[PDB]
Swiss-Prot record:
Its EC number is 2.1.1.13. The keyword Transferase applies. The gene is MTR. The chain holds residues 17 to 654 of 1265 of the full protein. The keyword Thylakoid does not apply. Modular enzyme with four functionally distinct domains. The isolated Hcy-binding domain catalyzes methyl transfer from free methylcobalamin to homocysteine. The Hcy-binding domain in association with the pterin-binding domain catalyzes the methylation of cob(I)alamin by methyltetrahydrofolate and the methylation of homocysteine. The B12-binding domain binds the cofactor. The AdoMet activation domain binds S-adenosyl-L-methionine. Under aerobic conditions cob(I)alamin can be converted to inactive cob(II)alamin. This is Methionine synthase. Binds 1 zinc ion per subunit. Monomer. Dimer. Forms a multiprotein complex with MMACHC, MMADHC and MTRR.
Length: 638
């Protein structure tokens, strides 16, 4: 296929990509009549500056620019479709034509590519460019309305799907999500591409390239390079990298950092230096070629090119410079065994990582303060609960909005949108927890990074679980699988192990799920309720954690720690004591993380020795009278 053909070329030599199409169009200096052409002569809105309309109004100019770039030495030419969505064309009144413009841009690029391929013998490729659009999902249009968004995930999915329909019907060889200002927009474009590839169309290679705005190393939406790579690698792009907004000397460290984090190829086409006082990126082609050759000799990049300021002279110099350079070899074992989560910053859970705290207090059903703030509509002050959780040591935040008084999806969308507006909250990943899958989808469609979906299970059959898991994989997030099946909630050790194994072998063998993205919850259940059947639950969880960790490769283990101490509510210190003891024994068992009260977990050594012994007796059922003894000990604290 096309992906194999491109991958074969990328292994032997470095590939050169198009260049500054807008810069070439600027030297043409077309006027309003030239932009309109004959067909749009009486169009009610101005079309000057709309470079995408030239594909139907001035095909000759676009074709000549493509031929110039290809004869310069470029191997891949982007289509003139940077603003060819219905949303981007809404400024020009050309919403209905987004399919037509994409089709004609693909055709006019393909004719030039075929002509140059015939004339030179070197096969050329056409990359369908999908622009970032002026609308942002992860950033509010106004400072005073942080939770407000003027565009939704579904609208952008529809627009990008129409654009990609136009591009694929025109016959592009590569799809290129470029100049990503918002990682959520890139995820929406990937979602649309997955819809198209799973409905009718054979897959095409996908090139993803972000944009580091400043020397701070973060995109426009605030995500770092590693976080961006983690977020957008669920679609498995053939190439990843950066473009524009920076010169090579300013882009080199970020390119190295990205190259060391992904097993995909690295594409880098930066601006031709900094703009001068006149506004022209004046870095000469020779200096650009030398900078890209320094990039290539170090093994930093695999695809080179130029963003704004790159004329075909720059492309000729770059192509002749990188002609003899040896390509980058991707690291095949990039963070093997780790679980790769992300918010604004990467969060990797490896085999030698400590216990990961997940903040339980952002739960409507299980936090009195959070529920009190949410039902009043005061999400602004309910964000302070997550702030305190992160300040207190929570590495992941668990979000739950399940209540009959609340509209689930709307509340979860608003809370995720408000979370994204706060930097220190947004750097840690989120845990999407809800019994309704609509709320889970609403949470996944508002997240910038890679989150965890909580509470998926075999409760409603194999087919429903499989469909939900397929949707989660398409969204590309991590997911927790409960030990819950058609017979009910798992309580015995053997039943927990059987349910977890059955869930695991479905996901990996049939759905092809990533084993490092699966988290198993053997259902920590309350003990010491006064009922003798409930006294073995902690032991069952610990043994199930043992067997699951030593029999299911790559699968993590988590659970709700506070569930174990429901019988002793109001007696907080004893609850923290059992939490410490159970955490000690479960981490010795293999519990990788858990939804826990982040700052209220004492270490096993500073627990009071008498209370330590009482909690050990209760949890391990060493004494049939343990629960009443612990209650009496609590009563002695009067
Ligand atoms: C049900 N349990 C759970 C689970 O067992 N397994 C998974 N995967 N996910 C989850 N998510 C929800 C839940 C864990 N979260 C919890 C569990 C318990 C509490 C809790 O004890 N809250 C206190 C009040 C909290 C307060 O106001 O301070 C209470 O009185 O009940 C608070 C949060």
């Amino acid at each position: 296929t096309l992906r194999d053909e491109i991958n074969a070329i990328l292994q032997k030599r470095i590939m050169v990509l198009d260049g500054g199409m807008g810069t070439m169009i600027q030297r043409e200096k077309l006027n309003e009549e030239h932009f309109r052409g004959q067909e749009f002569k009486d169009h009610a809105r101005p079309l000057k500056g709309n470079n995408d309309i030239l594909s139907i109004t001035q095909p000759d100019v676009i074709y000549q620019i493509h031929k110039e770039y290809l004869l310069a030495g470029a191997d891949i030419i982007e289509t003139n479709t940077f603003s060819s969505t219905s949303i981007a064309q809404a400024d020009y009144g050309l919403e209905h034509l987004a399919y037509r413009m994409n089709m004609c841009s693909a055709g006019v690029a393909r004719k030039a590519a075929e002509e140059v391929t015939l004339q030179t013998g070197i096969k050329r490729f056409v990359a369908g460019a999908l622009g970032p659009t002026n609308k942002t999902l992860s950033v509010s249009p106004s400072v005073e309305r942080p939770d407000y968004r003027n565009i939704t995930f579904d609208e952008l999915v529809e627009a990008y799907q129409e654009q990609a329909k136009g591009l694929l019907d025109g016959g592009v060889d590569i799809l290129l999500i470029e100049t990503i200002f918002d990682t959520a927009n890139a995820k929406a474009a990937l979602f649309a591409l997955q819809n198209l590839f799973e409905e009718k169309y054979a897959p095409r290679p996908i090139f993803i390239s972000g944009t580091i705005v400043d020397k701070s190393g973060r995109t426009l939406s605030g995500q770092t390079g590693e976080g961006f790579v983690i977020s957008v690698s669920h679609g498995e792009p053939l190439c990843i990298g950066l473009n524009c907004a920076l010169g090579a000397a300013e882009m080199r460290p970020f390119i190295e950092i990205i190259g060391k984090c992904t097993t995909a190829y690295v594409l880098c086409y930066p601006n031709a230096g900094l703009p001068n006082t006149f506004g022209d990126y004046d870095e000469t082609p020779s200096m650009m070629a030398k900078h890209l050759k320094d990039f290539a000799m170090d093994g930093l990049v695999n695809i080179v090119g130029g963003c704004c300021g790159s004329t075909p002279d720059h492309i000729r110099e770059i192509a002749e410079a990188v002609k003899n350079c040896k390509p980058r070899v991707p690291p095949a074992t990039a963070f093997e065994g780790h679980m790769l989560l992300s918010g604004l910053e990467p969060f990797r859970i490896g085999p030698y990582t400590n216990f990961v705290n997940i903040g339980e207090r952002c739960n409507v059903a299980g936090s009195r303060k959070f529920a009190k703030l949410i039902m009043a509509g005061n999400y602004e002050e309910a964000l302070c609960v997550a702030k305190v959780q992160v300040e207190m040591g929570a590495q992941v935040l668990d979000v739950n909005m399940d209540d009959g008084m609340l509209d689930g999806p709307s509340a979860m969308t608003r809370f995720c949108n408000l979370i994204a507006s706060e930097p220190d909250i947004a750097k840690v990943p989120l845990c999407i927890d809800s019994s309704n899958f609509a709320v889970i989808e609403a949470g996944l469609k508002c997240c910038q990074g890679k989150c965890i979906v909580n509470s998926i299970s075999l409760k409603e059959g194999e087919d429903d679980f499989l469909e939900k898991a397929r949707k989660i994989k398409k969204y590309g997030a991590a997911m927790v699988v409960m030990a819950f099946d058609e017979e009910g909630q798992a309580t015995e050790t053997d039943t927990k192990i059987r349910v977890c194994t059955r869930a695991y072998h479905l996901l990996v063998k049939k759905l092809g799920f990533n084993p490092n993205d699966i988290i198993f919850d053997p259902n920590i259940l309350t003990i010491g309720t006064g009922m003798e059947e409930h006294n073995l639950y902690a032991i069952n969880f610990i043994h199930a954690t043992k067997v699951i960790k030593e029999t299911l490769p790559g699968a993590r283990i988590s659970g709700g720690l506070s569930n174990l101490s429901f019988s002793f509510r109001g007696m907080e210190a004893i609850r923290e004591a059992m939490h410490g003891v159970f955490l000690y024994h479960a981490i010795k068992s293999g519990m990788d993380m858990g939804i826990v009260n982040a700052g209220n977990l004492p270490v096993y050594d500073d627990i009071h020795k008498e209370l330590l012994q009482l909690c050990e007796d209760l949890i391990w059922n060493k004494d049939p009278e343990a629960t009443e003894k612990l209650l009496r000990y609590a009563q002695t604290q009067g």
